[PDB]
């Protein structure tokens, strides 16, 4: 009734799936082999059997190219000195390669505009989402009309505290910042200043940005 | 020549964190030594990620569940990181929808047990003979070249060794059989599948190497 | 700046395959483009591996079950890889014998289950006011600094949030508690463990960023 | 019952064990989460609790430094939307850092000689093991007095085929090579030529060399 361990290859070029499967299976069963529950031979045969099935599935049925990408997982049971895969748990993902002829032109041309983009300031817009229990105001942040983050403003007297994050086009964290407000409406000040505020935000992991966006949005909902 | 930032294969939704993590790993010594600040590296990765966003999401229309692999050279000058955009390479692989894959995977879940029951059927074709008179055969699976074997005739007996890469990598270790020299060809054609039903499961790279070693003996 | 072959952490027994695999991966594009052959790369990795063997076994006296991390710069000249040995760096960690580790782990393993669910006790030390008048506290575990807490006094209420990195990373999200302003110090010293007993389990890196964000407001 | 899944960190610097533990557990339980069998919260708490316990073991009991390396594994059972660790399966390995001050000077000195050490053929020695049933001669190969490989010699007529493999000081495969030599001179020939032969051997992965050595040694008797 307990969950079974799972053989997972992660992403691998299709030409390499067989040795990925074998190496992962050996790594997972290293202790079973040292303990004498299983022999090397047992594990090699189990991996070889699974590769034999995958070959028919990936190469003959799905027609995967050797330069495509696959990810495979399957659960297995080791008991009574025998390994059995549970094929009802087999999952296969496939990604098909975009021909270089199609990509390279685009990349080449784009690389010419790149040195500009590296430095050029990101322009964002905002729309009000609501207020918190404590009277903070929450805004959604957008990049080219699409939602990418959130901002939270705490009104003071002719100033305010601002904090927020965006996930795109690069993940940024705007740490608590105190700013003088020169506009009757906080709304007006947020509209004209959001891009300037983020021009000094810090670069972080996407995961961190996502957490902060979600925390802020949760305070209004 | 320059260090290269390399992501390896990554799901597109995760490319930015991979870029950041790889760059920090590569420049950990330059930071520990004060040559660069944590901030310098974060900003470099951040700026690169911004550029990659426009490329991947706009120009290449990559979906977040696609796979990408990215590399670009960079230089560390005067405590600044500078990317060489003429070395920017991007690879893209587009996800096959579950609808196309799931039913097919489902079939093999069902057919796997009986598929494993069957001995793998191989066929052979003579390729040539070596300097010392060993006979070399190519091995095929469903008509396509997958391997090779080599047979050394002795007096009334013979040594056999070989490998196949597909449908699973198998190494046939040196095996001694009793057979008359003038029937070795008949022997190979009749018994290739039986010989390999007892071969060793190995890495593909090993089987690939053995097949090439064998074939090279009959190619001048 | 030159490319750098880097192994990351690897058991000494396996450093050779790591060096080889990393070198091929880094030169994948130069091979494709005929700048180098597979033979050239394989041979370069092989020669480097031989040199590292001598250093590891003769000079560093590394055991095959020790851990190493190696790096060295290289360039490609006239279709041949050339290593720059002035940039060779090797780090080594020596295995603590299993015989010494196992009794300690085994004994502790017996108590682990009890310890698993038990409440973590924290203490605090007031740091002081921020510019706008929130109050920051350091959080300590067993007399050691592990986190920070920031309290924003309201009208008969206070907002509290914070984080600790040890003994496990926890994030206390924005929480509104009923407390009088003159009672805040006492409330915090009295309730910090209770508050964190229902904090969010997070990554250590998240908690670190939050602790630094908070302490920077008063440093 | 069936063998349980195992949480394994691989090698990790001690200061990073908690996040490795958390990331691996999430990766392994991603499907249980997506299926509704477990929540993100369940997994986060399981990992956090384990990390809490590991903190006491690593930092206080084994007294690991943050810059040491550790590797941790423990089995766990998931069933009925509940994660339970089996602490009787907890295994921890520790490696203590060798101070830079101590290694750096050794490495720097060695690096002076490294280039001139590549102008040098690897010197192997051999010892005869025995003959195979068909009369091939098998030798063990040694480097620094230790067994690192094997060679097999098949006498022809005034000639011989030689092949073999070593795993140290770097993995090398000597492909079938035909050489001129009288049969009663093979021992002498092998002593005098093994190092010269391996100077042109193929560089391979360690496992490839191991397999050849074993297959050659298995033929003896």
Spell the H/E element sequence of chain A: EEHHHEEHEEEEEHEH
Beta-strand fraction estimate of chain A: 25-35%
Give the N-terminus to C-terminus distance of chain A in angstroms: 40 Å
Major beta sheet summary of chain A: 6 strands, antiparallel
| Spatial strand sequence of the major β-sheet of chain A | 5-6-7-8-9-10
Q: In DSSP terms, counting alpha (H) and pi (I) runs of 4 or more, how many helices of chain A?
A: 6
Oligomerization status of the protein chains: homotetramer
Whole-number count of domains of chain A: 2
In one word, what is the shape of chain A? elongated
Secondary structure: number of strands of chain A: 10
Structural class of chain A: alpha+beta
Radius of gyration of chain A: 27 Å
Most extensive interface: C-D, 59 and 61 residues
User: How much helicity do the residues of chain A have?
Assistant: 25-40%
PDB class: dna binding protein
Keywords: ssDNA binding protein, DNA binding protein
Assembly: tetrameric
Entry title: Crystal structure of apeThermo-DBP-RP2
Brief characterization of the structure:
With 221 residues, chain A is α+β, with helices and mostly antiparallel strands.
């Amino acid at each position: 009734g307990a969950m079974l361990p799972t053989l997972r290859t992660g992403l691998v070029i299709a030409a390499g799936y067989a040795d990925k499967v074998r190496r992962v299976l050996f790594a997972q069963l290293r202790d079973a082999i040292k303990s004498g529950e299983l022999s090397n031979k047992d594990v090699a045969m189990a991996a070889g059997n699974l590769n034999r099935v995958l070959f028919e599935l990936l190469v003959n049925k799905l027609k995967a190219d050797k330069l495509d990408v696959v990810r495979i997982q399957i659960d297995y049971e080791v008991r009574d000195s025998q390994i059995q895969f549970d094929f009802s748990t087999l999952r296969v993902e496939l990604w098909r390669r975009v021909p270089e002829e199609e990509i390279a032109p685009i990349v080449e041309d784009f690389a010419r505009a790149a040195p500009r983009l590296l430095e050029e300031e990101i322009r964002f817009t905002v729309e009000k989402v609501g207020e918190t229990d404590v009277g903070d105001v929450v805004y959604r942040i957008m990049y080219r009309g699409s939602d990418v983050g959130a901002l939270i403003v705490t009104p003071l007297n002719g100033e305010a505290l601002v904090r927020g994050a965006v996930v795109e086009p690069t993940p940024l964290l705007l740490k608590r910042t105190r700013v003088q407000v020169e506009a009757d409406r906080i709304d007006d000040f947020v509209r004209e200043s959001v891009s300037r505020l983020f021009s000094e935000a810090q670069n972080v992991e996407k995961r961190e940005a996502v957490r902060v966006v979600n925390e802020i949005l949760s305070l209004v909902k």
